[PDB]
Amino acid sequence: KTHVQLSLPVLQVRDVLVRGFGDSVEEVLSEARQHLKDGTCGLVEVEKGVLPQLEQPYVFIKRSDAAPHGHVMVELVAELEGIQYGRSGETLGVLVPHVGEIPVAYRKVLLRK
C-alpha cells in the first residue's frame, strides 16, 4: 500500500537510550524507515535544548499536506550540518530508536511509502 497509518510513541528526551539511527544520512534514512515498519520507532518533540541531546544526522518527520483518517501526511527528512536532505513542510519531531521507553503520548501519521 502506497501509504500506511502509524502511531508513533512520544518519548521524553531524557530517556531515549539510542539517540539516533546511523552515521551517514543514507544510513539514518534507512534504519529509520526500517524501525518504522517494524514498529520500533519513537518520536521526540523538538523544543529548546532537545536537539543538542540527539545524534546527527537527524531524521525529521514533516507535514507534506494540510490529513486522512486523522493521520497527517509526512515524509522523512534527514538533517546534517545545517543541510536538510529531502524537501518538506512542518517539523512534527525527530525519529529515534524506541527500545522500551514509556511514552507520554502517541502521534498518528501517514507515511508516503
PDB file of C-alpha atoms in Angstrom:
ATOM      1  CA  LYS A   1       0.000   0.000   0.000  1.00  0.00           C
ATOM      2  CA  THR A   2       1.288   3.337  -1.224  1.00  0.00           C
ATOM      3  CA  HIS A   3       0.656   4.787   2.232  1.00  0.00           C
ATOM      4  CA  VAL A   4       0.486   3.454   5.793  1.00  0.00           C
ATOM      5  CA  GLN A   5      -1.198   4.545   9.074  1.00  0.00           C
ATOM      6  CA  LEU A   6       1.062   4.503  12.161  1.00  0.00           C
ATOM      7  CA  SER A   7       1.100   5.606  15.788  1.00  0.00           C
ATOM      8  CA  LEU A   8       4.443   6.710  16.954  1.00  0.00           C
ATOM      9  CA  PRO A   9       5.059   6.915  20.712  1.00  0.00           C
ATOM     10  CA  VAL A  10       6.163  10.307  22.033  1.00  0.00           C
ATOM     11  CA  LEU A  11       9.201   9.792  24.257  1.00  0.00           C
ATOM     12  CA  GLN A  12      10.628  12.284  26.704  1.00  0.00           C
ATOM     13  CA  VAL A  13      14.147  13.211  25.564  1.00  0.00           C
ATOM     14  CA  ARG A  14      15.926  12.468  28.823  1.00  0.00           C
ATOM     15  CA  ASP A  15      15.183   8.746  28.489  1.00  0.00           C
ATOM     16  CA  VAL A  16      15.994   7.969  24.823  1.00  0.00           C
ATOM     17  CA  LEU A  17      18.590   5.192  25.112  1.00  0.00           C
ATOM     18  CA  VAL A  18      19.616   5.050  21.448  1.00  0.00           C
ATOM     19  CA  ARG A  19      19.914   8.633  20.315  1.00  0.00           C
ATOM     20  CA  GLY A  20      19.773   8.030  16.621  1.00  0.00           C
ATOM     21  CA  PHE A  21      19.879   5.715  13.696  1.00  0.00           C
ATOM     22  CA  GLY A  22      23.236   5.980  11.950  1.00  0.00           C
ATOM     23  CA  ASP A  23      26.284   7.899  10.825  1.00  0.00           C
ATOM     24  CA  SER A  24      25.543   8.717   7.152  1.00  0.00           C
ATOM     25  CA  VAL A  25      22.294  10.385   6.084  1.00  0.00           C
ATOM     26  CA  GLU A  26      21.659   7.419   3.769  1.00  0.00           C
ATOM     27  CA  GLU A  27      22.009   5.274   6.882  1.00  0.00           C
ATOM     28  CA  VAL A  28      19.729   7.243   9.213  1.00  0.00           C
ATOM     29  CA  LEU A  29      17.134   7.336   6.401  1.00  0.00           C
ATOM     30  CA  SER A  30      17.352   3.502   6.242  1.00  0.00           C
ATOM     31  CA  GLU A  31      17.453   2.235   9.853  1.00  0.00           C
ATOM     32  CA  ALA A  32      14.627   4.699  10.406  1.00  0.00           C
ATOM     33  CA  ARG A  33      12.357   3.637   7.546  1.00  0.00           C
ATOM     34  CA  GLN A  34      13.175   0.166   8.996  1.00  0.00           C
ATOM     35  CA  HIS A  35      12.494   0.608  12.724  1.00  0.00           C
ATOM     36  CA  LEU A  36       9.195   2.172  11.493  1.00  0.00           C
ATOM     37  CA  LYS A  37       7.728  -0.758   9.533  1.00  0.00           C
ATOM     38  CA  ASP A  38       8.881  -2.894  12.474  1.00  0.00           C
ATOM     39  CA  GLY A  39       7.125  -0.685  14.997  1.00  0.00           C
ATOM     40  CA  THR A  40      10.418   0.123  16.793  1.00  0.00           C
ATOM     41  CA  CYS A  41      10.427   3.874  16.039  1.00  0.00           C
ATOM     42  CA  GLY A  42       9.775   6.592  18.590  1.00  0.00           C
ATOM     43  CA  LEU A  43       9.409  10.364  18.258  1.00  0.00           C
ATOM     44  CA  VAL A  44      10.884  13.170  20.426  1.00  0.00           C
ATOM     45  CA  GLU A  45       9.124  16.530  20.133  1.00  0.00           C
ATOM     46  CA  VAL A  46      11.513  19.325  19.222  1.00  0.00           C
ATOM     47  CA  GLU A  47      11.732  22.079  21.863  1.00  0.00           C
ATOM     48  CA  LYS A  48      14.704  24.110  23.077  1.00  0.00           C
ATOM     49  CA  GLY A  49      17.793  22.246  24.088  1.00  0.00           C
ATOM     50  CA  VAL A  50      16.273  18.998  22.765  1.00  0.00           C
ATOM     51  CA  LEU A  51      18.251  18.677  19.547  1.00  0.00           C
ATOM     52  CA  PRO A  52      21.667  19.089  21.214  1.00  0.00           C
ATOM     53  CA  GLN A  53      20.792  15.892  23.101  1.00  0.00           C
ATOM     54  CA  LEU A  54      20.455  13.693  19.973  1.00  0.00           C
ATOM     55  CA  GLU A  55      22.949  12.164  17.491  1.00  0.00           C
ATOM     56  CA  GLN A  56      23.151  13.573  13.990  1.00  0.00           C
ATOM     57  CA  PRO A  57      22.359  13.151  11.132  1.00  0.00           C
ATOM     58  CA  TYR A  58      18.793  13.845  12.407  1.00  0.00           C
ATOM     59  CA  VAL A  59      15.738  12.193  10.792  1.00  0.00           C
ATOM     60  CA  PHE A  60      12.734  14.516  10.903  1.00  0.00           C
ATOM     61  CA  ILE A  61       9.099  13.917  10.082  1.00  0.00           C
ATOM     62  CA  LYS A  62       7.491  16.951   8.405  1.00  0.00           C
ATOM     63  CA  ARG A  63       3.956  17.596   7.269  1.00  0.00           C
ATOM     64  CA  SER A  64       3.673  17.226   3.495  1.00  0.00           C
ATOM     65  CA  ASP A  65      -0.071  18.058   3.216  1.00  0.00           C
ATOM     66  CA  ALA A  66      -2.563  20.075   5.294  1.00  0.00           C
ATOM     67  CA  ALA A  67      -4.774  14.682   6.709  1.00  0.00           C
ATOM     68  CA  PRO A  68      -6.611  11.432   6.059  1.00  0.00           C
ATOM     69  CA  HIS A  69      -8.292   9.456   8.855  1.00  0.00           C
ATOM     70  CA  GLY A  70      -6.936  11.930  11.410  1.00  0.00           C
ATOM     71  CA  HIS A  71      -3.412  10.913  10.363  1.00  0.00           C
ATOM     72  CA  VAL A  72      -1.235  13.661   8.940  1.00  0.00           C
ATOM     73  CA  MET A  73       0.812  13.217   5.811  1.00  0.00           C
ATOM     74  CA  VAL A  74       4.593  13.293   6.401  1.00  0.00           C
ATOM     75  CA  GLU A  75       7.819  12.189   4.737  1.00  0.00           C
ATOM     76  CA  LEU A  76      11.214  11.645   6.300  1.00  0.00           C
ATOM     77  CA  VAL A  77      13.818  14.428   6.084  1.00  0.00           C
ATOM     78  CA  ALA A  78      17.405  13.948   7.256  1.00  0.00           C
ATOM     79  CA  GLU A  79      19.309  16.903   8.703  1.00  0.00           C
ATOM     80  CA  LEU A  80      23.104  17.087   8.892  1.00  0.00           C
ATOM     81  CA  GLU A  81      25.395  20.125   9.364  1.00  0.00           C
ATOM     82  CA  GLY A  82      22.594  22.613   8.620  1.00  0.00           C
ATOM     83  CA  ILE A  83      21.599  20.936   5.365  1.00  0.00           C
ATOM     84  CA  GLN A  84      18.259  19.225   5.212  1.00  0.00           C
ATOM     85  CA  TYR A  85      18.122  16.488   2.555  1.00  0.00           C
ATOM     86  CA  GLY A  86      14.624  15.946   1.325  1.00  0.00           C
ATOM     87  CA  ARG A  87      12.219  18.851   0.984  1.00  0.00           C
ATOM     88  CA  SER A  88       9.166  19.182   3.204  1.00  0.00           C
ATOM     89  CA  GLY A  89       6.779  21.144   5.469  1.00  0.00           C
ATOM     90  CA  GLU A  90       6.303  21.366   9.260  1.00  0.00           C
ATOM     91  CA  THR A  91       8.703  19.522  11.590  1.00  0.00           C
ATOM     92  CA  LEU A  92       6.472  17.282  13.754  1.00  0.00           C
ATOM     93  CA  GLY A  93       9.507  15.954  15.630  1.00  0.00           C
ATOM     94  CA  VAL A  94      12.599  13.803  15.185  1.00  0.00           C
ATOM     95  CA  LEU A  95      12.642   9.989  14.960  1.00  0.00           C
ATOM     96  CA  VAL A  96      14.728   7.963  17.426  1.00  0.00           C
ATOM     97  CA  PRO A  97      15.005   4.252  18.300  1.00  0.00           C
ATOM     98  CA  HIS A  98      12.408   3.277  20.862  1.00  0.00           C
ATOM     99  CA  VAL A  99      13.643   0.330  22.926  1.00  0.00           C
ATOM    100  CA  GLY A 100      11.332   0.232  25.942  1.00  0.00           C
ATOM    101  CA  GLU A 101      10.778   3.913  26.718  1.00  0.00           C
ATOM    102  CA  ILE A 102       7.369   4.509  28.336  1.00  0.00           C
ATOM    103  CA  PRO A 103       5.520   7.146  26.268  1.00  0.00           C
ATOM    104  CA  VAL A 104       3.580  10.260  27.242  1.00  0.00           C
ATOM    105  CA  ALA A 105       1.545  10.363  24.062  1.00  0.00           C
ATOM    106  CA  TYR A 106       1.025   8.818  20.616  1.00  0.00           C
ATOM    107  CA  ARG A 107       1.102  10.688  17.319  1.00  0.00           C
ATOM    108  CA  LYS A 108      -0.792   9.305  14.351  1.00  0.00           C
ATOM    109  CA  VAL A 109       0.768   9.910  10.956  1.00  0.00           C
ATOM    110  CA  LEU A 110       0.575   8.621   7.354  1.00  0.00           C
ATOM    111  CA  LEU A 111       3.695   7.586   5.517  1.00  0.00           C
ATOM    112  CA  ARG A 112       4.338   8.084   1.800  1.00  0.00           C
ATOM    113  CA  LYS A 113       5.870   4.630   1.410  1.00  0.00           C
TER     114      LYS A 113
END
